[PDB]
């Protein structure tokens, strides 16, 4: 099916110390394959998936130098932003950045991204047309003008539609066993009496890959979203994911409800009913 | 593979 490659960068100012913290991680779909941590001893881009270990020294040297330039750039960005928003140097602030590409099932480019947040708020983003920038405020307008004078979007396009896609394909091939697999969820339901008149039905999906999945509760075939407790899909730690959805129902009415599970690895969607 | 151009804010 479809795939994506994403890099996630986090830089945090630390007034209490002599340097900011910078962490960069790369993912193919929901599998992390590299990391860089400004505070770690290696000072190199490190492998975090088996299939990236086959890349040679040239690769590790190049990713290391590039990521160190990212780190320096974001370090300066902290200062820049603090000045744009006239903030003191006494507080800790956060700059986040993500970029990458999506490809479809034919491994052809579908979408690209390049966006930032400051202190958890959207700062600037590349629009869907891949040619224009969304900048929410005056500060971001300043960044936008700097980028326009340097034709950043056009260069970014070359990366997003070229490099990103080509390397994503390389990775998909090299980690085929891992990356191009489909683990269908193992499902089951638990039941817990909460009171003398209500019970909790929880629908479980375990050991699935990739992370995307849909769990929905129905009552008499009617979608019950407005009353559903849904936890964040979570990592099992072995390259698979887990998730559950629960509804609180009147005791004696358990069988009126059904949990519906949708996943790529699933030929047909599953319908579960407490028995 | 990372981008090799490094825009600033």
């Amino acid at each position, epitope marked *: 099916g479809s795939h994506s490659m994403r890099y996630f960068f986090t830089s945090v100012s630390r007034p209490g110390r002599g340097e900011p913290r910078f962490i960069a991680v790369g993912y193919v779909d929901d599998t992390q394959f590299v990391r860089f941590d400004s505070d770690a001893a290696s000072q190199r881009m490190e492998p975090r998936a088996p299939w990236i270990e086959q890349e040679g020294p040239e690769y590790w040297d*190049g990713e290391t130098r590039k990521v160190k330039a990212h780190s320096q750039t974001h370090r300066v960005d902290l200062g820049t932003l603090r000045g744009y928003y006239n903030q003191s140097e006494a507080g800790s602030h956060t700059v986040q950045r993500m970029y990458g590409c999506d490809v479809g099932s034919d491994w052809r480019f579908l979408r690209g991204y390049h966006q930032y947040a400051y202190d958890g708020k959207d700062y600037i983003a590349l629009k869907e047309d891949l040619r224009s920038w969304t900048a929410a405020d005056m500060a971001a307008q300043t960044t936008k003008h700097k980028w326009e004078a340097a034709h950043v979007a056009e260069q970014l396009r070359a*990366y997003l539609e070229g490099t990103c896609v080509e390397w994503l394909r390389r990775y998909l091939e090299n980690g085929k066993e891992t990356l191009q697999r489909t683990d269908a969820p193992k499902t089951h339901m638990t039941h817990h009496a909460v009171s003398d008149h209500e019970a909790t039905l929880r629908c479980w999906a375990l050991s699935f890959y990739p992370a995307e999945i849909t769990l929905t509760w129905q009552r008499d075939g009617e979608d019950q979203t407005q009353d559903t407790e849904l936890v964040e899909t979570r990592p099992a730690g072995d390259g698979t994911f887990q998730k559950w959805a629960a509804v609180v129902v009147p005791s004696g009415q358990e069988q009126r409800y059904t949990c519906h599970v949708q996943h790529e690895g699933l030929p047909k969607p599953l319908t579960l009913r407490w028995e | 593979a990372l981008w*090799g151009f*490094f825009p600033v804010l």
Partner: T-cell receptor
Amino acid sequence: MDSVTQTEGLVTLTEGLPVMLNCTYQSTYSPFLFWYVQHLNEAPKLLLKSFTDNKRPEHQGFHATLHKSSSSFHLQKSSAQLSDSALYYCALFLASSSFSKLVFGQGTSLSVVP
Amino acid sequence: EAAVTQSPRSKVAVTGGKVTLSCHQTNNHDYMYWYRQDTGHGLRLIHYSYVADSTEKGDIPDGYKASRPSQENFSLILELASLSQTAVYFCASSDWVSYEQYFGPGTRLTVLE
């Protein structure tokens, strides 16, 4: 890949005639090219960029149109002047997969004569 | 505006001798580069640097070392000069807009036996 090829040898041109210096390239990803100029005992300096739509950006009556299909970025000017005598470099900017760097051609000497 | 200075402007050295070329820049540029030009042609990257205290190999590393002691200074070192290193060396600097590089005036080095 990732290379530039420029007109070889001295190019002699009478003042008033059009300048045409060839630059072709091989690029792995979408191309970005630049002309730099160096006058005799001076430093090389940026002259023009392949940016800002289709294949036509530019400087002082110099201009260059990028034709990606034939991978061409020829330097042109309508009427050469004696002051244009210089060394002209075509450069490929590589920053998509590798660390930002300019890859310079051999440079083509232009001598405009009276 | 952006300027870049080099020293010495000229140097005569002997094979086996140690040569150090200096470049200075007050543009607040984090990026610096050393190139060589031969018989009035080419501009080949030897070493570069993207921040003070770091250095990276260019296209023609061999026979040269580089030093970035501060943001302002970038040195090219030939530990054992050879006849092959006779050339004109140009240093340059840039900010993040790295396709626009500002060049120094150049150093003419001739190595002799």
